[PDB]
Design a protein around this ligand. Structure first.
Ligand SMILES: *C(=N)[C@@H]1C[C@@]2(CN1C(=O)[C@H](CC(C)C)N(C)C(=O)c1cc3c(F)cc(F)c(F)c3[nH]1)C(=O)Nc1ccccc12
Ligand SMILES: *C(=N)[C@@H]1C[C@@]2(CN1C(=O)[C@H](CC(C)C)N(C)C(=O)c1cc3c(F)cc(F)c(F)c3[nH]1)C(=O)Nc1ccccc12
Lengths: 296, 302
């Protein structure tokens, strides 16, 4: 029993982290095969096309611990810098690049100077920001999930907003949300609660012996959606009902019955899983992987 | 900026996890050098779990009775010895992935990362704290015994915990890497009760300093208190006593924010009497006690 904010085992990702230095700027790089992916803002003192044409291969100092890697080429893809290196990473795992949807979670391996400092779970907020923990030097730190034995890289850290939340790109350099890689005052849209994730966390509470919030009532998907609007909650789709199915069968509580419990919880407000708020940073798959004991 | 429940990168520990099987029992083992450390209850029979005689069961075991697997590589056991509640299995090959490591025994209130494993393979990593009643609030299912707790300063892995059992309340109990249980727990399937748990006061105060560092000031007040008056309050709320030693360790955080410890104590006293009134501190609607003053410094400074 027990329910914690559990990250993925970061072992496969640590073997990919390298230090990238350009001028007086030092950040992190993701070494996969013979390419090092890192935020392009490492070339700033901005016109990225201009600054990149004025760079040579040896202008980029890449370090894998104490081993200096020789840059044999460089190219830009959106907001990511791709540095071709002479040696392929022997610790390159089975990996792929994915772009996650708002509401999806991932583990962040925070790094400084190419070395991993810590690991934590994060959710891609519906306003396309992450509520992470990043200090100066953590750009290039990545977000990932693990399915079977494949690392799915979904996030690269680029910036912090004046509000304290963070923003970054997928591994193709495409920013999540309306953010740009300029050191300018940027504002995130009004954030909303990930409804399907709160429902999955309520199923995790039933699995761990918390039933006080349950009620006899059931609802329709349309009535529950009218309620979600009045509370800044993301709409619940029929697709979300299908992904909640396995958790609904394991507890014997229909999704629309748990929706009537969530409606009641939102109108009145005890603790659930040691929290005094409705937690939205656990997907239905996060609940299954923790409560079923999925390994990697 | 930002404040999260941050675990240590588990890479160095994943390379040490092996699967240990004894009879019909399968659990996790920690492979360091040519020794595999695991909970000794792996030698218990499904029938006699209440009062096993470990010295008696270990004398009737041979090296070939222990099946150790490192992924797909079966390791040959060349010897076996018992140290308190841990079983140490001498193996023929030294772990090539053995990191720089040491064994430490933590004090209640201290935090650490838990690499949860099943069948020798890592499932997940979370942050934990040694509760004042000597239990941990882990997330563990059957087959998780042998999973370890660790801290990684510089490049050395401090192994401080090995998972052994779950108590009827859903909390967990285990040993240090010398096999000494934390608390009054024994490795038997006998009726065991953890004492009434209490809140780690110094950790809540450190987390309040982390909130000021991250721009949360709503809970602050002009009042100050004495250490003795605050301690009378802590009792009325099931909080552990705040000692002068705790004031000293909180010093660096107090100097970085300019808020005296006894002033933050008057804010905690106020927070305990009213609550949150709908407000949140660092995204939590409760007073968090699982961050030591050193965890706050690690995360906020680097
Ligand atoms: C990456 N190495 C660091 C880590 C940091 C963001 N970051 C950057 O390099 C950012 C690059 C820009 C996208 C060009 N960066 C400097 C910012 O995001 C940034 C700078 C400021 C301010 F000066 C003021 C401000 F109000 C603001 F919102 C800013 N954002 C990160 O994740 N956290 C952090 C803290 C301190 C310095 C750097 C970074
Ligand atoms: C380790 N492989 C598993 C994981 C589990 C505890 N655990 C054990 O093997 C424990 C060994 C004892 C110390 C001999 N174990 C069986 C328990 O701690 C245990 C068994 C029971 C009960 F039958 C009833 C009960 F009320 C109780 F509190 C028990 N504790 C773990 O951490 N969580 C878990 C869940 C289910 C099975 C095993 C384990």
């Amino acid at each position: 029993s027990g329910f914690r904010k559990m990250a993925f085992p970061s072992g496969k990702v640590e073997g990919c982290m390298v230090q990238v230095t350009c001028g007086t700027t030092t950040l992190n790089g993701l070494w996969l095969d013979d390419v090092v992916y890192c935020p392009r803002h490492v070339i700033c003192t901005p016109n990225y096309e201009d600054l990149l044409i004025r760079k040579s291969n040896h202008n980029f100092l890449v370090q894998a611990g104490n081993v200096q890697l020789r840059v044999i080429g460089h190219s830009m893809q959106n907001c990511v810098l791709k540095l071709k290196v002479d040696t392929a990473n022997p610790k390159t795992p089975k990996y792929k690049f994915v772009r996650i949807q708002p509401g999806q979670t991932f583990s962040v391996l925070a790094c400084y100077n190419g070395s991993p400092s810590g690991v934590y779970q994060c959710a891609m907020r519906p306003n396309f920001t992450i509520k992470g923990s990043f200090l100066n030097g953590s750009c290039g730190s990545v977000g990932f999930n693990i399915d079977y034995d494949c690392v799915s890289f979904c996030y690269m850290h680029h910036m912090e907003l004046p509000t304290g939340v963070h923003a970054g790109t997928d591994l193709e350099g495409n920013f999540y949300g309306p953010f740009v890689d300029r050191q300018t005052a940027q504002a995130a849209g009004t954030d909303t609660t990930i409804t399907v994730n709160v429902l999955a966390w309520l199923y995790a509470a039933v699995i761990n012996g918390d039933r006080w919030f349950l009620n006899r009532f059931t609802t329709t998907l349309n009535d529950f959606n009218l309620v979600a609007m009045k509370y800044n909650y993301e709409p619940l789709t029929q697709d979300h009902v299908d992904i909640l199915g396995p958790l609904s069968a394991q507890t014997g509580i229909a999704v629309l019955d748990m929706c009537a419990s969530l409606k009641e919880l939102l109108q009145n407000g005890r603790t659930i899983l040691g929290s005094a708020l409705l937690e939205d940073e656990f997907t239905p798959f996060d609940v299954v992987r923790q409560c079923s004991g999925v390994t990697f």
